[PDB]
C-alpha cells in the first residue's frame, strides 16, 4: 500500500500523467477511477447498427499548435491509418421563416460577423481596466455603435448568427462572459475517429495493473509525516509520496462545501487552501450537451457538414435597435418586448452532418445551457425528444432538398431510427461539460491556484488547470504531462 | 513674403493641415503644390458618358476606427448626402481553366486561407522573433508544414488565392515582406463616392488665396537666423516660421541623391538628419495601379462586387510539394520549374471591382501590382494593346458571370452596339509610377523592412520648424488616406497651439 504517485481520475489528464511517469522510469504508481471505464469526458458510445459516436469531446481543436493532435498525425503518417478527418466546412445557417441565410448576396451576414468579432477584439484586446459584460450585451453594444452601417435584415439576423459561439462554451449568450467569448482558434479543427482510440493508446502506455476502476476516492490527507494518505470508498487505504488530482472542476468544488456524502466529493485534510477555495468564485462550469439523431439512410444534400439553426428573431427587435438612444434605453425597451415556452427555435443549435464527412447517416447536434439540462433530464423519453426537435429537423431536411422526418424509432423520406443523448449534467463524476466563464469571471485565478498545487505533494491536473487548451482535451492532456514531469524530476533527486 | 506656415503639397495631408490652421484662427499661410490641381493621390476622373472614377484612393479603410470615415458618416447624418457605400462582398475567385473556385464544397479554399493567415500570425508573434522573408516564402512553408492536411487542389489553388494580398500592398508576393503582409482590417471598408468630395470639402475650408498651384518647391533652408526659406522652381522665394512638408516618401527619398535636376526633388540645408536618411533603407514604396473598364450597360450577373482572377497554376506544383523533403529541396525543385515565357493577364492575380452591383455603374475597376503596374501604365495611351492584353481575363469573367465574350466598341464612329453581349466603350489607366510627383502608389514593406523607423523620424520632424506629414509619417492608417489626413491635423494642431501661446 506504499506508492510513489497516485493519480485520481482516468480521464485524459490522468492517463497522460501515468503514461509520462512510466516514460520517465517511475514505478509503483496507481490510477484510481470512480467509473468502471477510463476516458472521463472522452467517451465513445454505440448506437443503431453498431454506429460509433463521441458523446463527449469529438474534435482535435487548434491543429496548428495542438500537441496531442500532432502525435496522432505523426502516427497516421507512419502507418496510414485514418484517425481523424478535417471536417471544417462552409456553415449553412437556417432561420425558421426565411430558410437558408448563409452566403447571401444581400444579407452578407458572415462579413458583418467578422466585423463584430473585430469589434470585440478592439473592445478588450488593446485595453486594460475594461469592465466585462455578457456576450449578449456586447452584441447589443455593437449594433448600437454600427446601426448606421447595417441594414434592417442585418440587424435582425446577425445577433442570432453570432450565437454559434454559445456552442463553443456550452452557455447561453446572456450567461456568457464577453471578455472570454472570442478566443482565437489556431487553425482548423479535426474530427476524431474516434477519441476512444486516443484514450486506449495512452491507457496502454503504462503498466495495466496501475489502473483501479470502480474506485471512488473519498478523502485525501497530508500528515506532517510528508506522505499523503488516500482513502477509497471500498475501505482501501493507500500511502503515496505524491498525488495528482484530475477530477473535474465541478467535482472538486464539492470539497469546499460541508455536505460529505456527495458522489465524487473528496474530503481534504488539511482543507484546500483559501486561494483555491476562493478561485471557485471566479470561474464556473458550462453545459455543452449532445444529441445524436440516427437515420436509416442519407436522403439529404451533403453540401455541408456544418449546419446551424438560428433562434427566432423579430422585426420589432430591429425597430427597437434603431430607435433606442443608448444602451440603457435599449435594455428597457427589450424587456417590455419580452413581457412563452422554450422550443427548438428558442436558441441556436449546431448540427453536424456526419454523412458528408464520415459517410454515416446521422446528425450530431450540440446544445447549450440552459437547454442542455432540460434535455438531459428527459433523455429517456424518446417520443418527447422527437416532438421537441421535430420542427428544426424538418426545416433542415427541407433546406437540404429532402422531406419531413418519419418517426421509425419503434421512399426518399428520412426515417429516424434512434436518438442518443449525453448525460454529463446528471453524471456525478462530471457534473457539467467543462470550465466556462460567466461575466466577471477570471479563469487565470483557478489556473494559477491549480498549477501551484495544494502543497508540494498534492497536485492538480485537468482541463481547468491550464491556460493553453483551457477546456480542451489537449489542455487536459498537457496538464497531465506537466504534473508528471515535475514529479518525475523531484523523484530522481532522491 | 513673410508667412506663419508654409505647407508643401496639397494632397489630403496638406489640405487638412491648412484646414486645421484656418480652423484655429491662424492667418497668412500658404499651400504650395507642384501639380496644376489639388488632391495628390486622391484624384477622381471622368470617363465615358460622364461616369466618374477614383483613379487613386477609392475606399475608406478600417471603418470601425477610421476617424476620417467617422467624420464623413457624421456629415451624412447631418446633410443627407450619400458619400460612400459598403461594398464588402463575398469574393468570386476565377481560375482560367476551372472557372469559379470560391465557396466550393470540395476546395474550401477560404477556410485554409484563414488557416494560413493564422499560421502567419503564429510565425511572427512567438516570444522569439524570427527573420522576415517574402510572402511567397511564407506560403511555401505553410504548404510544406501542412501538406498532410491539404488535398491536391487545395495545394494547387490556395497559394494563388492568397495572393489577393498583393492588391493590398501593390507588390508581387516575392517582393513583399511576409511580416507586413497580414495586418488587421478594423472592420469593413467603404467605397467612397467619391474622394473628390472629400478633397473639395477640406480644400474649401481655408482661404483660396492660400493655394499656389504649379508651384514646385526645389529647396528648403533653415537660416541660422532662425526662420525657414522656401525656394520655388520659378524663382519665387518665401519666408516662414514653420513648414509642413507632405510630399510623398518616394519624392522625399530624392533628397538623399545629389542631382538637383530630379523633378520634385527638394534641396535641404542643412541636410535631412541621419536618422531620417537611414530610415529610407528600412521602408520602400509599392505600385498599386488601376485600370477602369467601361461598358455600355450591365449584362452580367451582379452576385458580387468583388472578383479576383487567380494567376495560372499547375498540377506539377502539387506534385513538387508532395515530393519535397525540406525547404531547400522545395526551392530547388521550384526554381527548375520556373526556368522551364511572356507576361500575360494570367501571370498574376488581378482584383476586379464590379461597380454595377454597388454603384449601378456599368464598369469594372481593376487593381494591379508591381511589376505589372509600370508596364501597363507605360502603354496607357494604347487602347487596342490594353484591350488585347486584358481580353482573356475579361472574357473569362463574363463567362463565369453568365455572360458572353466582350465586344470592342471603343470607337464611336463605328456605331458598335449589341443587346446580349458586353460592349466595351473605354479603358482608363492610372499613371502613378510615371508621375514624378508620386513615383509609385504608397509606402510598402520589402522583406526586412521596418516602417517604424520612418514614422518615428518623420513624426519627430527635421527640426522644430521643419515638419513632415503624409501617409508615410504615421502608424495608424499608414499608407492610407486617413493616415495622411490625421498626420496633417497632427502637425497643424501642434503648430497652431504653439502660435496661440505666443
Ligand atoms: C459534450 C462535451 C463536448 C466536448 N467537446 C470537446 C471537443 O470537441 N474537443 C476537445 O478537445 N474537448 C471537448 N470537450 C472537453 C474535454 O472533454 C475536456 O476538456 C476533457 O475531456 C477533460 O478531461 P480531464 O481528464 O481533465 O477530466 P475528465 O476527463 O473528466 O477525467 C477526470 C476523471 O476523474 C474521475 N473522478 C471524479 N471523481 C472521482 C473520485 N471522487 N474518485 C476517483 N475518480 C474520480 C472521473 O470519473 C473522471 O473520469 C468536450 C466536453 C464535453 C462534455
Ligand atoms: C492607386 C492608389 C490606390 C489607393 N487606394 C487607397 C484606398 O483605397 N484607400 C486609402 O485610404 N488610400 C489609398 N491609397 C493611398 C492614398 O492615396 C495615400 O495614402 C494618400 O492619398 C497620401 O496622401 P498625402 O497627402 O500624404 O500625399 P499626396 O496625396 O501624394 O500629396 C502630396 C503632394 O505633394 C506634392 N508635391 C510633390 N513634390 C512637390 C514639390 N516638389 N513641390 C511642391 N509640391 C510637391 C504632390 O503634387 C502631391 O500632390 C491609394 C493610393 C494609390 C496610388
Q: How are the secondary structure elements laid out?
A:
2 copies of one chain form a homodimer.
Chain A: E1 2-8, H1 12-23, E2 29-32, E3 44-46, E4 52-54, E5 59-60, H2 67-79, E6 84-85, E7 92-95, E8 99-100, H3 109-124, H4 135-146, H5 152-161, H6 166-169, E9 190-192, H7 195-203, E10 211-212, E11 217-222, E12 228-232, E13 237-245, H8 249-252, E14 267-269, H9 274-279, E15 284-285, E16 289-295, E17 306-309, H10 315-323, H11 327-338, E18 349-353, H12 354-358, E19 362-367, H13 371-376, H14 382-399, E20 406-407, E21 415-421, E22 435-436, H15 443-451, E23 458-460, H16 473-492
Parallel strand pairs in A: 1-2, 1-13, 2-10, 7-17, 11-14, 13-23, 20-21
Antiparallel strand pairs in A: 3-4, 5-9, 6-9, 7-8, 11-12, 12-13, 15-22, 16-19, 16-21, 17-18, 18-19
The site of one flavin-adenine dinucleotide has 42 residues of chain B, from helix 1 and helix 17.
GO biological process, one term (chain A): pantothenate biosynthetic process
Organism (chain A): Saccharomyces cerevisiae (strain ATCC 204508 / S288c) (Baker's yeast)
GO molecular function, one term (chain A): spermine oxidase activity
Amino acid at each position: 500500500a506504499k506508492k510513489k504517485v497516485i493519480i485520481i481520475g482516468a480521464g485524459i489528464a490522468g492517463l497522460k500523467a501515468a503514461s509520462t511517469l512510466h516514460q520517465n522510469g517511475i514505478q509503483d504508481c496507481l490510477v484510481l477511477e470512480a467509473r468502471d471505464r477510463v476516458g472521463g469526458r472522452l467517451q465513445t458510445v454505440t448506437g443503431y447498427q453498431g454506429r460509433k459516436y463521441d458523446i463527449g469531446a469529438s474534435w482535435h481543436h487548434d491543429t496548428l499548435t495542438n500537441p496531442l493532435f500532432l502525435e496522432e498525425a505523426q502516427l497516421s503518417l507512419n502507418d496510414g491509418r485514418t484517425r481523424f478527418v478535417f471536417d471544417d466546412d462552409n456553415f449553412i445557417y437556417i432561420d425558421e421563416e426565411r430558410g437558408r441565410v448563409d452566403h447571401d448576396k444581400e444579407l452578407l451576414l458572415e462579413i458583418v460577423d467578422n466585423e463584430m468579432s473585430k469589434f470585440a477584439e478592439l473592445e478588450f484586446h488593446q485595453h486594460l481596466g475594461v469592465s466585462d459584460c455578457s456576450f449578449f450585451q456586447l452584441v447589443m453594444k455593437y449594433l448600437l455603435q454600427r446601426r448606421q452601417f447595417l441594414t434592417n435584415d442585418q440587424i435582425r439576423y446577425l445577433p442570432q448568427l453570432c450565437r454559434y459561439l454559445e456552442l463553443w462554451h456550452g452557455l447561453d449568450w446572456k450567461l456568457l462572459s464577453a471578455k472570454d467569448t472570442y478566443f482565437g482558434h489556431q487553425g482548423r479543427a479535426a474530427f476524431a475517429l474516434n477519441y476512444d482510440s486516443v484514450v486506449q493508446r495512452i491507457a496502454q502506455s503504462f503498466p495495466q495493473n496501475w489502473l483501479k476502476l470502480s474506485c471512488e476516492v473519498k478523502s485525501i490527507t497530508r500528515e506532517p509525516s510528508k506522505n499523503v494518505t488516500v482513502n477509497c470508498e471500498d475501505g482501501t487505504v493507500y500511502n503515496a509520496d505524491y498525488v495528482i488530482i484530475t477530477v473535474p472542476q465541478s467535482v472538486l468544488n464539492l470539497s469546499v462545501q460541508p455536505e460529505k456524502n456527495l458522489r465524487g466529493r473528496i474530503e481534504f485534510q488539511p482543507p484546500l487552501k483559501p486561494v483555491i477555495q476562493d478561485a471557485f468564485d471566479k470561474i464556473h462550469f458550462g453545459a455543452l450537451g449532445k444529441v445524436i439523431f440516427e437515420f436509416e439512410e442519407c436522403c439529404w444534400s451533403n453540401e455541408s457538414s456544418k449546419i446551424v439553426t438560428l433562434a427566432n428573431s423579430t422585426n420589432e427587435f430591429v425597430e427597437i435597435v434603431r430607435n433606442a438612444e443608448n444602451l440603457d434605453e435599449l435594455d428597457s425597451m427589450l424587456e417590455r418586448e419580452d413581457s412563452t415556452s422554450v422550443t427548438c427555435w428558442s436558441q441556436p443549435l449546431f448540427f453536424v452532418n456526419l454523412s458528408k464527412s464520415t459517410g454515416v447517416a446521422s446528425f450530431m447536434m450540440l446544445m447549450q445551457a440552459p437547454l442542455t439540462n432540460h434535455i438531459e433530464s428527459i433523455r429517456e423519453d424518446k417520443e418527447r425528444l422527437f416532438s421537441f426537435f421535430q420542427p428544426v429537423l424538418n426545416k433542415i431536411m427541407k433546406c437540404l432538398d429532402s422531406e419531413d422526418v418519419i418517426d421509425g424509432m419503434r421512399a426518399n423520406k428520412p426515417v429516424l431510427r434512434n436518438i442518443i443523448v449525453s448525460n454529463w449534467t446528471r453524471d456525478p463524476y462530471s457534473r457539467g461539460a467543462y470550465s466556462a466563464c460567466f461575466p466577471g469571471d477570471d479563469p487565470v485565478d483557478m489556473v494559477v491556484a491549480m498549477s501551484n498545487g495544494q502543497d508540494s505533494r498534492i497536485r492538480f491536473a485537468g482541463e481547468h488547470t491550464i491556460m493553453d487548451g483551457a477546456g480542451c482535451a489537449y489542455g487536459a492532456w498537457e496538464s497531465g504531462r506537466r504534473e508528471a514531469t515535475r514529479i518525475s524530476d523531484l523523484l530522481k533527486l532522491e
